[PDB]
Design a protein around this ligand. Sequence first.
Ligand code: ATP
Ligand code: ATP
Ligand code: K
Ligand code: K
Ligand code: MG
Ligand code: MG
Lengths: 96, 524, 524
Amino acid sequence: NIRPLHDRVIVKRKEVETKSAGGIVLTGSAAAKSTRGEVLAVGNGRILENGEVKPLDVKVGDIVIFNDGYGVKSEKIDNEEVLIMSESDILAIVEA
Amino acid sequence: AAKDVKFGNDARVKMLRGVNVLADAVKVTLGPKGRNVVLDKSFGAPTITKDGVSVAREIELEDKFENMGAQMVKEVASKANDAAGDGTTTATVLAQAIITEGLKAVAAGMNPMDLKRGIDKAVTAAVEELKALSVPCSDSKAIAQVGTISANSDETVGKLIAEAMDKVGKEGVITVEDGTGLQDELDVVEGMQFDRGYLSPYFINKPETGAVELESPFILLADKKISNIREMLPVLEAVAKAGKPLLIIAEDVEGEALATLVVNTMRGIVKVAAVKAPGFGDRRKAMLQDIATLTGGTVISEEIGMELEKATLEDLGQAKRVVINKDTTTIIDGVGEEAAIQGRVAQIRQQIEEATSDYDREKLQERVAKLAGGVAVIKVGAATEVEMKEKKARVEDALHATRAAVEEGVVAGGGVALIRVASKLADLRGQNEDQNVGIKVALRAMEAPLRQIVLNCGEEPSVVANTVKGGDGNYGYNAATEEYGNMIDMGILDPTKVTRSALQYAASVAGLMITTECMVTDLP
Amino acid sequence: AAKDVKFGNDARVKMLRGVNVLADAVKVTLGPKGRNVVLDKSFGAPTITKDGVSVAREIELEDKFENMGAQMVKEVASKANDAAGDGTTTATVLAQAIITEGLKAVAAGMNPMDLKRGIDKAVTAAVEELKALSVPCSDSKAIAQVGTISANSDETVGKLIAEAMDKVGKEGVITVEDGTGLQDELDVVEGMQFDRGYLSPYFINKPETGAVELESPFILLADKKISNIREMLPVLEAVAKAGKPLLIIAEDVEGEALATLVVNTMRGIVKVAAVKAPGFGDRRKAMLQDIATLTGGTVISEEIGMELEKATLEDLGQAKRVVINKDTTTIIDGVGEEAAIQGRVAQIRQQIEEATSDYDREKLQERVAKLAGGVAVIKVGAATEVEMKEKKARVEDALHATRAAVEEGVVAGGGVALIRVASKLADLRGQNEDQNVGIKVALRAMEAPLRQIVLNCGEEPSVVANTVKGGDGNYGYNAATEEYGNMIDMGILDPTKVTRSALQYAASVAGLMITTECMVTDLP
Ligand SMILES: Nc1ncnc2c1ncn2[C@@H]1O[C@H](COP(=O)(O)OP(=O)(O)OP(=O)(O)O)[C@@H](O)[C@H]1O
Ligand SMILES: Nc1ncnc2c1ncn2[C@@H]1O[C@H](COP(=O)(O)OP(=O)(O)OP(=O)(O)O)[C@@H](O)[C@H]1O
Ligand SMILES: [K+]
Ligand SMILES: [K+]
Ligand SMILES: [Mg+2]
Ligand SMILES: [Mg+2]
């Protein structure tokens, strides 16, 4: 099991959309990596200048949008690819 | 530059002198008693050859008008070699006789256009009579006799070519190359035998032979080149779960992926081996798909869409045996559907029919022989280089004659077929008297191969020609024993394609040459 | 360009005149009393030679048809030099005699194709009779006599070559090079003696000789080139724990790693010495693996998977003595498994058999001689450059003759082997009279080497030929003493391979040349 630290989140990326809106199957770079993924593990929270830990607004099991870049890292947990990022790199939570 | 212009009989005489020079160079080789011709080569030793196309190619004359005649009559041997590969000497003998007899009627005041029309009509009827007279040649002894006769009565060459055609079947491809020994060697390969070796020397399962042996292995076909072990790592893990060996046909396996797979090979988890994909662009993909069809697998490519990561065991090909070595690789009994194999055979045959280039068509035929049937390589054995070239030319002519024999059939050799055809065409008539005379000179010139064979034997051409014309059927003149008999029984067979092609090309060029009146060349 | 075309007897006479020019240039050197030929070289001094292949190569005639004849008969000496290295003069003597006697029968109206068939049949039977007549040559005295006779009766060359083959054994490789002194020198090296020196001058353990001596040293084989000391630092520490000297065979040792190891060498912790790996790519790995097999070690490479960091003492090779000098490096008594060594010899011998190029095959044979047996270098000693070239050619011919003697055996020299063969083939018959006459001219031309030897001796060829034919067995004509006797007892032996090859190549080219009727060359 993996749980993150401070203001960082462990997220499994959602499966890439193989088929477009109108039944057109996209492959390769057309099947670009999804920016959405379910939250696997939430850290304790951001440490401010006062040393207090503020819990993150993200919750375990919620689909969220993440921005890939230098902030995001790749990891393998139980032979499965996951991404590692901070709550700033998390854009928004997908509901309904 | 400035031009010399000759008209009428002067130009005809000069052109005929050039034709006579080339044809006299060519026709000293006709028949079994025909002698060799030495051609001086500016680079290397001179070439001793008995085939008329080479000695026709090498002829070029100082007189420009005689050089015209030589080049125009050389076109006959060139076309006969391009189409049938044999009978170039017979084609030049026929072409010379039509020109000499045609110019005799041209000098007789007859219209050369009508003479050419008569020659064309007579030779069309002659082709029809040759087709009617032909007998199909499918049995092995007839093929052996055709190969023997076409190779200057060399029974070893004929029997070797007959055995090669028997081994590789009708769809097989047979080629002739030089050998290292003094004797003729036949090398027959079955299944896919593409000429690429292992990428690393460490794959060798059998060190005493340098050949990797894989018993019932999996086959992966990657249309792309790979340098990372990541992509087929699921496939490698699935193969290790299966435990069977795996052979990769890829554009390039190099560096990291290659090193890790050879390491896994000597670790014993997977008995894996990777080799380069054959051919080049626009050709590699097609016969990679042919390998996939043979092995019942599918090629991995970006265009077809699935990647090596989603490649599974079902995607990979299957064969019963795989042999890797330094230069080539053999796949024995690829586990693929028979109906798919025949569909691929039909598709490549349609590609052959649509192919208008000899190189592409011969590559397609080689691919057909690779996936279905076999491939034979005849190594010409000779003590010296010049004997190597001479024997190689003779074996090539014998191979072309056997191919023409299975393609179109056989007739009585020694020019007897043309004699019988001319005898059958005795009542053929044209629209006018000049056309009838052109028909007659065509019929007379069909006796030229037999007459020149007898002349090469040293006997009298007229007596033997009349004796053969007196006989009926395939009765003719054995030029080796100088006897008479049924030319089929004595094994003197000629391919119907060879004789018909020689007659047609000789007739076409010779008619065009007797139609001329003026010739314009450069000044000396 | 434009061509001159000659037919029949005119072309045959011109071609025979060219053959006579080349063969008369060549055959003045045959036998022990044969003289030398001076060949003009546009670059350097003229070459005085007694070998017929150089004279044959340097002959080219102004008359283009005679030049055809010269080139065609030069092919005989070229092929005889390529195959056996000796008997080029004998091959040209045989080829000229077949052509002259063959053209005599051709002028006699006999069929040249049947004459060539008869010559081929007679020479096939002659090869069989030479094989039956041959005796294997394994003893040292017979080898010395063969080397002496092949070197114009030079007993010093023959005895030196006999000693060289005795030293390096049957698997050894012997080569001839120029020497600095006036006398012949033999240089035999045992074990691996690849030609790379120490990478830095400071490794020298013995300053009075400039050679590093390592007693029972460890050997590390690095396929990759190293520039950092970190990788073999565990290996260096393990060696320092062992305390034995260490020798590196690497692609390149340079920079910080090289400086660190030489510093540690003069500090006395490790007695290390690094040298370059021999050869270049695709051959460096094979001979590195040969070094590993000899020393019982394993080559460190990225492809094989293990790294220098994981390399241990067991991975490193072991030998008893190591000598490093400026140009070469000698390994004496490499501690390796004998069975693995012989498996390596078998593998490289299979590679030799599969090799179709002289360069690759000779490199493989040199590798075999390095790993097993020894390598001999014969330094030709002569006071002048021209004598150096002449003596070097004679020693090369003697070496090729000794190699052919161990390969195929020996027969009576001086052309008596061919005389006995022709006497044995007296009852051989062809399919017709022309073939019988071709057989007879082949048999007569087998007397040509003896007759030309006698002609060079100044005596009468016919009397001596009849006297030798009257005798039986190896009775023949000593051409140096002008006497008669048993040629084996008199020490005049010829390699069976040399005589058989000369006869075969002469027969093939000569038959192909007598079959000709027309010759087409460029205009003058
Ligand atoms: N023993 C024989 N008896 C009778 N005719 C023979 C005999 N051997 C060959 N022929 C005939 O000789 C003719 C030509 O032989 P050859 O192969 O020399 O010429 P070609 O095919 O015209 O030449 P090229 O190889 O240049 O095309 C053929 O029609 C063949 O039937
Ligand atoms: N003392 C001798 N008595 C009799 N025959 C001899 C004697 N010495 C040499 N011969 C014979 O001389 C022949 C040819 O000798 P030589 O080495 O000059 O010619 P080659 O081997 O034909 O030429 P090349 O070196 O150009 O290939 C051989 O058949 C050899 O047996
Ligand atoms: K011919
Ligand atoms: K000589
Ligand atoms: Mg032919
Ligand atoms: Mg010699």
